[PDB]
Design a protein around this ligand. Structure first.
Ligand SMILES: CCCCCCCCCCCCCCCCCC(=O)OC[C@H](COP(=O)(O)OCCN)OC(=O)CCCCCCCCCCCCCCCCC
Ligand SMILES: CCCCCCCCCCCCCCCCCC(=O)OC[C@H](COP(=O)(O)OCCN)OC(=O)CCCCCCCCCCCCCCCCC
Ligand SMILES: CCCCCCCCCCCCCCCCCC(=O)OC[C@H](COP(=O)(O)OCCN)OC(=O)CCCCCCCCCCCCCCCCC
Ligand SMILES: CCCCCCCCCCCCCCCCCC(=O)OC[C@H](COP(=O)(O)OCCN)OC(=O)CCCCCCCCCCCCCCCCC
Ligand SMILES: CCCCCCCCCCCCCCCCCC(=O)OC[C@H](COP(=O)(O)OCCN)OC(=O)CCCCCCCCCCCCCCCCC
Ligand SMILES: CCCCCCCCCCCCCCCCCC(=O)OC[C@H](COP(=O)(O)OCCN)OC(=O)CCCCCCCCCCCCCCCCC
Ligand SMILES: CCCCCCCCCCCCCCCCCC(=O)OC[C@H](COP(=O)(O)OCCN)OC(=O)CCCCCCCCCCCCCCCCC
Ligand SMILES: CC(=O)N[C@H]1[C@@H](OP(=O)(O)OP(=O)(O)OC[C@H]2O[C@@H](n3ccc(=O)[nH]c3=O)[C@H](O)[C@@H]2O)O[C@H](CO)[C@@H](O)[C@@H]1O
Ligand SMILES: CC(=O)N[C@H]1[C@@H](OP(=O)(O)OP(=O)(O)OC[C@H]2O[C@@H](n3ccc(=O)[nH]c3=O)[C@H](O)[C@@H]2O)O[C@H](CO)[C@@H](O)[C@@H]1O
Ligand SMILES: [Mg+2]
Ligand SMILES: [Mg+2]
Lengths: 801, 801
């Protein structure tokens, strides 16, 4: 029973109210001309208007048995199929017409909701579609709105760009077919001896997903608002940047929408999230990009059984509570999550000269690939011209930044005034990777992107000077740039700092002054295990794949968790001993004396202050639970975050997806067939003249000496990226080691000090380093706390107005 | 002018004498039946007897213008072509007949000379062919020989197995055609809808290479002994093991020769080398394998301009003078060079049960490859059965040993008495790689092979117990096994030992007792550069290819050479200071006192003794020049040998040649054509019944829940080999570091010692380690010296008898 009566859950009371506000009796479509086995394709393109299944029409309320058509409008009766051969670059240049703009009265799009899909299960697509449909129903129900209200569904288009014709999951395809967008027969591989790049299906579906259980998806036609669906199935997978090219460069130009919303399969927006994003864009005309709070689902996951899920939950909550508000207050957000964000279409458009955010974003796809262009592609000229252009370090490595480049390119425009804003009213829920390998692979992409984006923005900070912002705005943008520079410096030396803190804390327990016997043996054992884990992580990152050697990573993570617990114990013990010593001294006890004590101060005051700031920020946002349920897991996993993820990310900076190539010869000399008789039919030279001529040709060929040939080939790009990655890790290793040598004198530096002065000189440097690092962390926390408080105050003030 | 009058060089006086001993007027071939465009292929196989070019026949002395045939025999007039489809396993089972055995009177082969070729220049092939032809002429000229003499060329077959139909160099193919073996037209790709695995051309050429200059090759028919040529051109490259399978498993069974000789393109044997190898096999019936001295050409290479060539020259000379004689004396040679060696055919044959040296040798090819068998291959059953068999660690990694496995498998047979012998009378000259990358790639293959062969032989030493050898023979074989165990242990810890020696020597100069000011700063700088070089070598070995990043390796090698010079200087300085201190003490000077002095003893006596042993061994073999011309380069390159080559070899234990695979979909849904009118011809569903049935099918498909699917796939073999390589480097790193920590207390061990006792406890361990390592090297040198002296004495005694 695919179709079941509509049922509202406990949380669907708002949906019920929306339904009460909507009439549900005036879903009348606009008449449009159809396309006529011989078919009259429009403008020389293959276009087919096929009829939808009779059962699906019979489900619709407007269906009437008496009328053969059923009384339904043309758009509700026929689904349109178009075969696209040109590709994104020339889609607008060719006369490719989408149905929304083909009506006698053109429809102007107000909100384009892009969904990216790749071999995703039907459950994830069902959840995303249910969220989008609920949002559209809410927008329709809205009464006292200038832009929204009756017939609001005509201004909204849902675009699903599936990457990979043969990689799409069968069940998701079945679901889309059940909605009526897709039919199996229509697909065509080639048209007029030209490859079909993408298959586009268009239909205004009136089928709504009633519920999405864990295993099955139920669809019902009762109380469903029509939704314009565009399903663009790509013939071959070209990653996500190519899908975004299809969305922006090709479909966006034809539709010319406002406020393009980007979604990802499995991300379920709230009931009013899209309205909140639209309102954010509408209130302030300067806003060019926006993002919403992203949450992690914890439905059937236990606190103890899934430490990783809760660690990620805490990370997401802290990010949304501290980082995004501060950057939004400054007006420049480092990263807008690709799972849920929104952009204003006009802001992204390139300049007359051809330079703009979209050009920078797309260049990464072209440059980061094998230099093998098929001459038959119609985009051959564009790709050849792009490859012939002189590319520097930054241009040729844009693929690391990905969408992150867009944020900076928007803020620091030549003569434009744009800002990026974060709204906490918009919420979306997603499933985080439970397994360790997927987490490692996912964070590998985030870390590389963040590092490259930070470097690129910092190096090009001067571009904001020419932007038409207020002078105070530029001053505060420079303050934020300085903060990001400090954050980058702190993140670059994370592994060295972690090792230094661990070594100092463990060796401090070895001192005979405090009464801890196993200090020394434990410190030595932990040092050996630490070095072994680091070396194994490097070797596995360079050599093997995470999926295969997962148990090694699990063991390393467990060891680092135990080591973190031991480090916390050592710090507490060290502080207690220091406090006890002051009382044992016999001196007067004052508040200045506690602050004067470097050990107690650094170890306790800084960490407690950071925890208090996190706690207060969590409470002020009415989101306190993560500070209890998921704090411990995050604390215990932090060293793994710094060591394993960072090492794996840097070791694989190059993402070499393409493989080796081979011309593989195959001259078609010929074949020998066998007749009924034993004789074989062959074709070999017979005439003596031909044989003698061939022999003389061979003699003349071998008579002359071999001319020199100097290989001056451009070579392949995989070597270039392998080289870039190798240099980065080497510089990363060298700089970290220099810092470690200075602080601990591990290298030859101990040769310059005396044996009696070695013990006294190592201690002072360690204390200075500990205080510096801890107070740097604390001050960054305070900075973000002030940021978030300002964001709350200003948002409340704007709401009041 | 391809053909020129024969000219004899200064060194061709022996060739002139050979010519004087040969009549050159009775080169009469045996009549054989030919094969009849329709051709009557023999036994259902595609066989063609085409006529050779008229000019080539006209060159031959026996040609007569009056007779249309020319008076030449059938074999000299027609070249035979055969297309082989089955492959090596079934070549004998099918009725594939080679010309030498097809005569009315069968010819018994006495010497099969195999030459392996792959995209080699025509110069290398010309040199090899000139050497082989000169050897055949010498064998023919021999008068007072029971086996050799008149008509000796009938007992010798030269087999050229070219790997890769489309990778063979054009000029070498032109040369072979000029000889008359190859013609372009004959090749056929498919026969009876079956792929042609190999193309075999047979011809008894009477064309001899007069000379081989640096650039061109000249051929002349004057004073040439006929040679039986078999040119087996493979359709696709399958590395060298597959070529050896063609030689042994398929061609050898048909010909059934004795004493198969293996050669490599560019290796030029001496004028009497093949006779020496044959005599070695003939004298003693127990000998199953033999090898000869291999020399490095130094024609147009300067002493200073090519340090690498002279380093390799010294290495080869020392090997031939010390290692091979000792192993030959014991009767078991670890490696028989693949460039020039010989095997007795019957010794290699497998047992009735199917287990034997050849099976072990070939299993490596099958196991070490992608598990993708084409069902159309006729060897599908064999490969599938081999893959289904349970393979342990050793069986699945045989590909590392390569031919090395054969030596041990021959010596330690179940019930056979076989020995391996080295003869210094046989000499062959080859070109060593001048570039650094090629040297790195070539040594990468040697080191992996040697390590795995040593481990395999040591683990299975007990197999020699069942062999039918004399008890004393088994005792001495066990002595050799013990020596090889010590050598393996010494080689495993080479990198750690080198670092320890460098550190001890450099830090010794830092002591204030001796008056050297820059000691400390230089030691620290060198430590930093050493660590940087090691880390960069690891990273580049894992990440990049040697050809691309060659300058890094050049810089590292130059640095290591400078460091070696500095280490030698430090040792000399340390010894001089120690000798001076004894005189400054004021005590009596005796010979016992010098020996008592650990510093002087270890540093000077051991190294001088090793050098003296090398010098004496070189002189006794009448090969003294390498001890002067090329010693310094070898000494300066030794640290590079240990560090760079060993690191690169271990980092790339897995040799993953095969690439990724993709089914790549491509369902043939259909195409749409365009008619003269605008209408497009398409095929899409029309009947309502079919559409409704498809829709109901989709509904039923999506209605049921998704059943669980647990991935229990066997997976790919590349992960297995990546895993094996990763473990090996990790164990290699761990064991070396443990030794370093013990000797220098680098790890946490210094925490267990006092500051005043740290300086005194580090010195004693360093002295003990230095004496141990140096005297181990010296004693191994003495062992090999005694070995070589015994070899000389016994060889001279055998010659006298
Ligand atoms: C009880 C509460 C203890 C809290 C300790 C938590 C340590 C967190 C360290 C840290 O965050 O360092 C800052 C930086 C990482 O920055 P962050 O924003 O947190 O991570 C981004 C995730 N994508 O990464 C770094 O720079 C790491 C700096 C070194 C961290 C050393 C941690 C030492 C642990 C001392 C515990 C003392 C406990 C005292 C309790 C009283
Ligand atoms: C950090 C320290 C890590 C120490 C090793 C933890 C290993 C935990 C474990 O149980 O892993 C076993 C793992 C299983 O291997 P397997 O899954 O069968 O390989 C499939 C290939 N596709 O792997 C194995 O079965 C091999 C067992 C380990 C081999 C020796 C490991 C030495 C590495 C430490 C070097 C220290 C430097
Ligand atoms: C990559 C991830 C690991 C990075 C580790 C970086 C190591 C920096 C070493 C700093 C250092 O100088 O260590 C001290 C030592 C020099 O001082 P030393 O005189 O030997 O000892 C003084 C005793 N108080 O220097 C040393 O200890 C030398 C270190 C050993 C070099 C060995 C090189 C060949 C073998 C490679 C082993 C790989 C490591 C395996 C670890 C498990
Ligand atoms: C201790 C706490 C000290 C807090 C001190 C700052 C408090 C806010 C003061 C706001 C004054 C704004 C003056 C101004 O004109 O700045 C430019 C911009 C308004 O002009 P705009 O709208 O961009 O263009 C017209 O206005 C802005 O750009 C406002 C940017 C505010 C960023 C606040 C971030 C606070 C967290 C960092 C603390 C350090
Ligand atoms: C051992 C110490 C080695 C130090 C580096 C020696 C470099 C010598 C040199 O001149 O090499 C330059 C090399 C040329 O690079 P290129 O050929 O243009 O790349 C082609 C990519 N297919 O490479 C370059 O041009 C890049 C220049 C070096 C980049 C920084 C190297 C830092 C590595 C040291 C890390 C220490 C830990
Ligand atoms: C692989 C090829 C390199 C192998 C190197 C192996 C290093 C073994 C280290 C042995 C060791 O224990 O070093 C000493 C130190 C511990 O003793 P510590 O108290 O810190 O110093 C005593 C001062 N007399 O231990 C240390 O110095 C710790 C070494 C640094 C670990 C850093 C890990 C993250 C950064 C990686 C840097 C990579 C190395 C770059 C070198 C250039
Ligand atoms: C100080 C120098 C001390 C040298 C002491 C050894 C001198 C040679 C003594 C030779 C006695 C041979 C006795 C014997 O029967 O051994 C077995 C084998 C002869 O028997 P076989 O031909 O194999 O079968 C029948 O004969 C053999 O296998 C001979 C093997 C000789 C290997 C000599 C290697 C010397 C270098 C290592 C020095 C340690
Ligand atoms: C948290 C979340 O909900 N999604 C993020 C997660 O995705 P996640 O870790 O779940 O997996 P991916 O990054 O591979 O997928 C990202 C998006 O790209 C699409 N895709 C994937 C593979 C492919 O060959 N072609 C293709 O188009 C996927 O369908 C998905 O819509 O890590 C990515 C790393 O960049 C982010 O970009 C995504 O925003
Ligand atoms: C010193 C010398 O003179 N030859 C050695 C050298 O060869 P070298 O370093 O010169 O180059 P290779 O090892 O690649 O060639 C070895 C042999 O295998 C053949 N080949 C090569 C590639 C291929 O795809 N197919 C193929 O059949 C080559 O033509 C040659 O006959 O290092 C090899 C490492 O094992 C040794 O085996 C060779 O004995
Ligand atoms: Mg996902
Ligand atoms: Mg070669």
């Amino acid at each position: 029973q695919a179709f079941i009566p509509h049922v509202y859950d406990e949380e669907d009371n708002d949906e019920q109210e929306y339904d009460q506000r909507i009439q549900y009796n005036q879903f009348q479509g606009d008449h449009f001309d159809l396309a006529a086995t011989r078919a009259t394709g429009l403008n020389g393109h293959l276009v087919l208007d096929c009829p939808v299944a009779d059962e699906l029409l019979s489900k619709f309320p407007d269906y009437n048995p008496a009328e053969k058509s059923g009384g339904l409008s043309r758009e509700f009766a026929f689904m349109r199929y178009t075969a696209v051969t040109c590709g994104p670059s020339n889609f607008y240049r060719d006369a490719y017409i989408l149905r929304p703009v083909h009506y006698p009265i053109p429809r102007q799009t107000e909100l384009m909701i892009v969904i990216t899909m790749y071999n995703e299960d039907d459950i994830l697509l069902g959840r995303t579609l249910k969220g989008v449909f609920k949002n559209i129903k809410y927008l329709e129900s809205k009464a006292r709105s200038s832009t929204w209200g009756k017939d609001s569904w005509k201004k909204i288009v849902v675009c699903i760009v599936s990457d990979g014709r043969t990689k799409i999951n069968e069940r998701a395809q079945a679901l889309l077919a059940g909605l009526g967008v897709y039919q199996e027969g229509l697909a065509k591989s080639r048209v007029d001896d030209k490859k079909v790049q993408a298959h586009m299906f268009e239909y205004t579906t009136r089928v709504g997903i009633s519920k999405v259980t864990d295993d099955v998806v139920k669809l019902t036609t009762e109380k469903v608002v029509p939704v314009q669906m565009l399903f663009c199935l790509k013939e071959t997978n070209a990653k996500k940047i190519n899908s975004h090219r299809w969305c922006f460069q090709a479909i966006g130009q034809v539709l010319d929408p406002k406020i393009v919303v980007l979604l990802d399969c499995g991300t379920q927006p709230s009931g009013r999230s899209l309205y909140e994003l639209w309102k954010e864009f509408d209130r302030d005309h300067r806003v060019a990009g926006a993002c919403g709070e992203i949450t992690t689902s914890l439905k059937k996951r236990q606190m103890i059984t899934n430490p990783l899920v809760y660690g990620q939950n805490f990370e997401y909550k802290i990010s949304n509570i501290l980082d995004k508000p501060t950057e939004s207050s400054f007006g420049f957000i480092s990263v807008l999550p690709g799972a849920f964000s929104a952009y204003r279409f006009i802001a992204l458009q390139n300049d007359i000269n051809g330079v703009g955010p979209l050009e920078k974003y797309f260049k990464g796809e072209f440059l980061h690939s094998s230099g093998e262009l098929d001459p038959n592609d119609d985009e051959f000229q564009m790709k050849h011209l792009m490859l012939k252009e002189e590319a520097g370090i930054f241009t040729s490595n844009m693929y690391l930044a990905e969408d992150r480049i867009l944020c900076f390119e928007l803020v620091a425009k030549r003569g434009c005034n744009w800002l990026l804003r974060y709204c906490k009213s918009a919420r979306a829920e997603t499933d985080v990777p439970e397994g360790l390998a997927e987490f490692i692979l996912q964070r590998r992409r985030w870390l590389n992107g963040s590092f490259f984006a930070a470097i690129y923005s910092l190096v090009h900070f001067y571009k904001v000077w020419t932007s038409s912002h207020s002078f105070g705005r530029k001053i505060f943008l420079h303050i934020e740039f300085f903060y990001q520079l400090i954050n980058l410096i702190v993140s670059w030396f994370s592994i060295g700092s972690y090792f230094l803190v661990f070594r100092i804390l463990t060796t401090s327990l070895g001192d005979k002054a405090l009464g801890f016997a196993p200090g020394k043996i434990l410190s030595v054992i932990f040092l050996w295990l630490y070095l072994a884990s680091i070396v194994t992580t490097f070797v596995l990152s360079f050599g093997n794949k995470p999926k295969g050697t997962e148990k090694f990573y699990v063991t390393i993570v467990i060891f680092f968790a135990i080591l973190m617990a031991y480090m916390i114990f050592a710090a507490i013990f060290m502080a207690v001993h220091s406090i006890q010593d002051i009382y044992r001294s016999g001196t007067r006890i004052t508040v200045s004396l506690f602050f004067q004590n470097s050990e107690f101060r650094d170890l306790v005051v800084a960490t407690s202050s950071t925890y208090a700031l996190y706690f207060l920020a969590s409470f002020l946002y009415f989101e306190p639970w993560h500070m209890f349920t998921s704090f411990v897991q995050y604390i215990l996993l932090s060293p793994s975050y710094v060591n394993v993820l960072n090492i794996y990310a840097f070791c694989n900076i190059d993402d070499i997806s393409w493989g080796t190539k081979g011309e593989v010869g195959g001259k078609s000399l010929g074949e020998a067939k066998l007749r009924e008789d034993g004789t074989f039919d062959v074709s070999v030279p017979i005439s003596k003249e031909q044989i003698n001529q061939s022999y003389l040709d061979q003699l003349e060929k071998i008579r002359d000496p071999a001319p020199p040939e100097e290989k001056v080939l451009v070579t392949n790009t995989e070597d270039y990226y392998a080289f870039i990655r190798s240099m980065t890790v080497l510089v990363w290793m060298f700089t970290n080691f220099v810092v470690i040598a200075l602080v601990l004198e591990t290298g030859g530096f101990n040769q310059f000090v005396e044996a009696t002065d070695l013990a006294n000189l190592k201690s002072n440097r360690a204390a200075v380093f500990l205080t510096v690092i801890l107070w740097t962390v604390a001050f960054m926390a305070l900075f973000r706390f002030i940021g978030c408080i300002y964001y709350l105050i200003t948002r409340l003030g704007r709401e009041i107005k």
